[PDB]
Design a binder for this molecule. Structure first.
Ligand SMILES: *CC(=O)CNC(=O)CCCC[C@H]1SC[C@@H]2NC(=O)N[C@@H]21
Ligand SMILES: *CC(=O)CNC(=O)CCCC[C@H]1SC[C@@H]2NC(=O)N[C@@H]21
Ligand SMILES: *CC(=O)CNC(=O)CCCC[C@H]1SC[C@@H]2NC(=O)N[C@@H]21
Ligand SMILES: *CC(=O)CNC(=O)CCCC[C@H]1SC[C@@H]2NC(=O)N[C@@H]21
Ligand SMILES: *CC(=O)CNC(=O)CCCC[C@H]1SC[C@@H]2NC(=O)N[C@@H]21
Ligand SMILES: [K+]
Ligand SMILES: [K+]
Ligand SMILES: [K+]
Ligand SMILES: [K+]
Ligand SMILES: [K+]
Ligand SMILES: [K+]
Ligand SMILES: [K+]
Ligand SMILES: [K+]
Ligand SMILES: [K+]
Lengths: 352, 345, 363, 374, 349
């Protein structure tokens, strides 16, 4: 087994539990932004994923119907979904739309919701209907249907609510936090687009085509180490379907110089080409969005990152995993950080 | 019946025949680009659609695979594929890659090609393979195979060739035309996005997600008339499915009758409810009048010349107002006032 | 445990490794033809399976398309595919067409290749196309595509090559053998055809419909023991998906009844130690073939005879699964198991007993 | 302005039969041919039972599908070789002993429900998940009993003995009394994916028995048709009939579209948009395309010539303009312009024939020798 | 040891039977029940042929699938009502005149191949595109001949006449010699999507005959169990057993989330939700024939199953009264097993 010492942490909020839903993109976004609110000085916040999970789905439904089934309709999503939704739909406190409130529960189970809405969206998007029906205001009946089924399972979005004495709209509540989409940028590292460029990652949950900035794998890993040591958290989207990623709370990248996962061992540090290949050949897919809040060493001096997951606190380190550098550099798909976490030099190469 | 008289037309090249493939996007784009080369004094070109179709399908296959099948793999394309293609792949003359050359024909029939390539792309993009194979230089084998099958049915793309006594590459040939993708804007008119912004049209053949400037409908149609009256032609993407231009070479809303002039909401309705779909690409190159004063855009099609007007036909202004999905024009074809509200230099 | 003593074995070449492809039919065929070349005093050969696997698949694709999908398109095959191929396509040394060279590997993994080529062949053979395309010389476009894809994953087969100071074509390299397909006969033992006649085994991988001579099962086993005691090896096709065939190197047909006669009324060691064996009648063997218990013609090579502690007789088999097994790629198949589960064998004509040869009309 | 035919020479045939709603042409054409053969050999008029042979053939085809795990398709078709092998293996019985339709109050076959049931039964065995098929204490397969029982329910119980014109027979002894011999008959084809003057099994689905055909150059292959007819023999004729030239009105022609378009008035561009009724391509005598060995090969290779239909060629005729046709006895009843007879132009036969069976003595002597047929 | 049981009161059962590889629990449990009824009525021990009844019921179930164009599923299951209707309609035969496995050289059922063919045959008629099924000159349907002939090939020829303990019978006259009457048995259930003291057909796929059950409030429903056992009757017991764990130790018990543990005692509504939300399905048929207690005094119904005797209690096992109350779907008892007052509340004379 492993024993880990913390080298450096930055404040996070409590550990949340997405339970039975592919909502990691939203719980990790909010985990990341809550940490940002703490460091900006706004106090502790608990935002409602269910509210923008709800709204993102209706748009995605619309996108699947426009593209006649090309845009897959599924539970997942992106960091960009949250940043966009925040400026578009607003934000509400968790208290106004909690997981599981409609089926006598306290945590999400979205399996039946998906069974119904997947079939509905597919009956429109991939069926044989030649002319979809609308009302006298040209509003579509199938979107009423889809939105109504989502509210039956997720709750009805508040149009107005009271929070800590003052009443809000989701927009004005969003303005109360003082977050701006522009402050944060998405970064990645691949060779099938030129470096220091903008491209939308070619993954199904990026159906909105959110753009990402493209660094070489060594500058890319310098923003991670810089962001931590200057006091920032990172929204970390990565591939966690790996023999190295454990349910015992550790994500390593063992070598063949060696019980590869159970005890500390030499790490395999990847070139840029070995890494691009894994994304081209399906060994690296957009599995999971989490939050990395700092740095640590194990009992042999090997270096790891402190990640906060969205699976509750029933695990070896109460819902926290340790992700090794060799793992984070091989299998990261994108990270969203705030601009001020970039080094000056890295920021400079094509960056305001 | 209809009797038309031309009001104004700008030069076009000859009518081509796409035959049996859904390559209208490329054929119309090249009719539009060739007209542009005439406008700019560069003379008459016949560009190879097959060459651009070839390279576009390879990128579409890679998009299908990367998105695990979400990007459909089909014969279709957009005006942006041709514009992106020329800057990315270059151009070659017609005779360097002709339709039908590999199966003893002179016109396209891509049904077998699609049947084989559709099955290969899906076996990768929607199968169960978890580690796709690569050579010792990290080049993917499935890409080699999809390209190899495309070459067997469409031809080996030239790396160099001689054209009117001068040697080129596809890149240096394109450079010799002086065309710039930066000169062309895409325009559309819808209410599910704000006017005077850019969004990418939500249609399966825009898998590259090329942006269009969104204009209110009355100004959208001002661009049509202004482009034609000042010497430009128009790359024209529209739903022709229900139009009945198959019967007489005319599209209306068989005698001249008053056209229902659509509002912005009725036209947004048809797009939202699937009545306006299957974006077909052609070229608008003039304005004509029927014997009762009604107004039509003259359309160059890519279905050959065995039709009532020898491959051209007429689309009433109203029809074009209702069923257009996007157009591509030179920047200089936009009126000064409209151009300024979009930030276009 | 098991302890084995060799009674008589005949030289084989080294144990090869087919890895992740259903190409046992070709590796076993070549294990047998290389043992043949050794026994004709021609030296140790390593013929290229990939060259023959490549050409076999193009024929098999053509058979699928001509029959509109009835001939299944898959990775398997038969000994006849190899003897047909040696005389139709030629032969090349291993070095000219290696497993895995196209995808930075040293052993085969044909899963992605099959993924692609199964889908292409099915798009033609089971699709709705009414007029396949062809070029100015009437050569079919689909065939070219299929061939180009096989080349990308397996290799470009050589037109000419140099081997030990001499240069060859695959054809001329095969004439360099002295091997003649007419020298080898296929034998089986079933009762849905009369004995001493020829019929094509009704199995999917016999899509060329190679004939086999049908023997009574007792004379069928005589051929085994004579072939081998007289110096020959056997190309051995049988079903190995049985309780008795194990990954621990043993293939037994144990009589579960006479085992459970010793010390119990059981509710344990039926394959991990010498045991009594069921000796099948011609009828029980027919039943398992009729009822799907004997299937999946897996190909291997028999080269030796051995006994265990209690004198039971076993055939020594050379597998094509590598050398990380209990006996470094060698299995032991009891004579009872072979008699029950064999689908067909190929031997040289002169390995037959004289009366068996005369009864089958073999010159 | 249609077709008017005059017979040049035809040889005796029995009456036109009607296979109706079943894919049994192979056995109907085979028995049209064998009945002409018995007439030719002086044995008189027979009406052999197709249903008997269809019944036993499908049981063999079911077994083939099961042994090959569904590779051998199970469907209604068949081959000439099915019937020749059949007469020597199962025997023959007279029509009266197993009539079409008799089990479902009908006089003509409708095998749609029989196929619906037995295709589904055969596929449940051959392509399903069963790992050990069941057997009784004599090792007979239960699935074969079930498939036999359902075939008997829709087609009838085959006789083991019957009386015919005062004499009791079994199927085998009735076959023996006709004096037919399968070894008297040869199958011939003409393709180039195998060398000439060899035998190979045509690679088509209904040849699941892999019956062989002798391969001839196209011109020699056509000489056989003529020599057979002109010396008193008839021809079992396996052909593609899915062509615009093969019509419901008793004609099979192979027009040269270019030529007809040049005889006509309109140029190429107008003609492409002319009316099919105005083209008159299949309704009057027209110049024929006369294919090469290679064009014939390409159509087989490329799916334009498929194994569609078995019939009997028994004569040679001319139309009012002197063009030549083979006379074809079909098996679809007599409600058609020529009472169930088709006239197939020589061009059509040369281009779309898949294989033929004739008695060995129908072969021209020099061709017989090239084939090694003694 | 975990569970140690003491019998409080059990009623005579015949030997434990083995349905082996077929979903014929409905018929084996029906006959366990009816054989106990025969013992109770003083007629002695019988061994009735499930295969005879299974054969005739599938031919009816195939007809029901064909008439509803595939809505009635065709599968191996069935109901107690199938057996009660069957005995009045087809008769009964002794086990020896139609044994499991006899046609394929076994002694136990394996109906996998039989289903593979007959499922495919029934679907080809009921779900295909045939517009006019074929009939003979007497208007008997050929597809029914086909399906009948295939069932006989795998299950045997049903006897028309046979001799048993020295007397010759037909299936009907053997049934009459037992003295059993379908009218003597009532079907009971407990749900709230229909009113209490009414009859309705349970909405489960194996009740394609739409046999009616009387609906009782849960407490009165359990009172019938105890009354039947304590006055000497047994119970045809249909319930969900899927997630119960009886396989491991012979014991079905109610999870509060090996050893006797506290049992959640469900309400009518808790029991209703599980039938509405799919937690209670796969009605499995067995026989309850006694009452037992464990070492700590908790009470169980004794269950006779039909899977042979290679289990911890030799084919018998124990269900807590709480499990039985939560997971039972329907029961059949003789009318005289009902308390007088429940009898009156349902109008049963
Ligand atoms: C990025 C994500 O949210 C996916 N990561 C997760 O941890 C969620 C997956 C857990 C598996 C659950 S969700 C869907 C499925 N249905 C169910 O009842 N359990 C499964
Ligand atoms: C915008 C497009 O290209 C679709 N428009 C067309 O005009 C395509 C027309 C050719 C029709 C061909 S395509 C595939 C199909 N297969 C065939 O043999 N004819 C059809
Ligand atoms: C006669 C044969 O070759 C049958 N197969 C073997 O002997 C062992 C190799 C099969 C294992 C491979 S085949 C295709 C499949 N795909 C994969 O990755 N492993 C499997
Ligand atoms: C060689 C053949 O027998 C091909 N078929 C024919 O020549 C005539 C058959 C007409 C098509 C019938 S068969 C079965 C199907 N069911 C129906 O009602 N009509 C179809
Ligand atoms: C109410 C029932 O009969 C379901 N209960 C059972 O005990 C049936 C389970 C036996 C398992 C057999 S039956 C069908 C399936 N096919 C097979 O070969 N084993 C399975
Ligand atoms: K939260
Ligand atoms: K992975
Ligand atoms: K062109
Ligand atoms: K080798
Ligand atoms: K087996
Ligand atoms: K007849
Ligand atoms: K045809
Ligand atoms: K019984
Ligand atoms: K349950």
């Amino acid at each position: 087994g492993f024993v880990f010492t913390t080298v450096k942490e930055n404040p996070i909020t409590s550990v949340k539990n997405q339970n039975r839903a592919g909502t990691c993109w939203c719980y990790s976004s909010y985990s990341f932004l809550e940490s940002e609110l703490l460091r900006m000085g706004k106090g502790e916040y608990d935002l409602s994923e269910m509210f923008t999970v709800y709204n993102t789905y209706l748009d995605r439904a619309d996108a699947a119907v426009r593209t006649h089934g090309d845009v897959s309709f599924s539970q997942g999503g992106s960091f960009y979904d949250a940043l966009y939704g925040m400026e578009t739909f607003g934000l509400v406190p968790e208290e106004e739309m909690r997981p599981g409130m409609m089926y006598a529960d306290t945590l999400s189970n979205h399996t039946e919701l998906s069974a119904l809405t997947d079939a509905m969206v597919a009956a429109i998007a991939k069926g044989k209907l030649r002319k979809l029906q609308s009302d006298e205001n040209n509003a579509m009946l199938w979107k009423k249907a889809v939105a109504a089924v989502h509210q039956i399972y997720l709750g009805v979005p508040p149009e107005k609510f009271t929070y800590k004495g003052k009443e809000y709209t989701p927009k004005s509540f969003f303005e109360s936090t003082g977050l701006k989409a522009s402050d944060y940028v998405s970064l990645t590292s691949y060779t099938h687009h030129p470096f220091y460029t903008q491209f939308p990652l070619e993954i199904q949950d990026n159906w909105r085509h959110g753009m990402s900035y493209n660094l070489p794998l060594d500058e890319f890993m310098e923003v991670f180490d810089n962001a931590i040591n200057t006091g920032y958290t990172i929204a970390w989207g990565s591939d966690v379907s790996e023999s190295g990623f454990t349910r015992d709370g550790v994500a390593v990248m063992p070598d063949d110089e060696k019980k590869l996962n159970t005890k500390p061992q030499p790490q395999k540090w990847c070139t840029q080409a070995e890494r691009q290949l894994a994304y081209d050949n399906y060994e690296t897919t957009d599995d999971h969005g989490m939050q990395i809040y700092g740095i640590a060493k194990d009992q042999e001096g090997n270096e790891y990152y402190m990640v906060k997951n969205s699976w509750g606190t029933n695990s070896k380190y109460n819902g926290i995993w340790y992700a090794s550098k060799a793992f984070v550099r091989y299998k990261t798909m994108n990270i969203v950080v705030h601009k001020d976490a970039l080094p000056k030099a890295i920021k400079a190469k094509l960056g305001i």
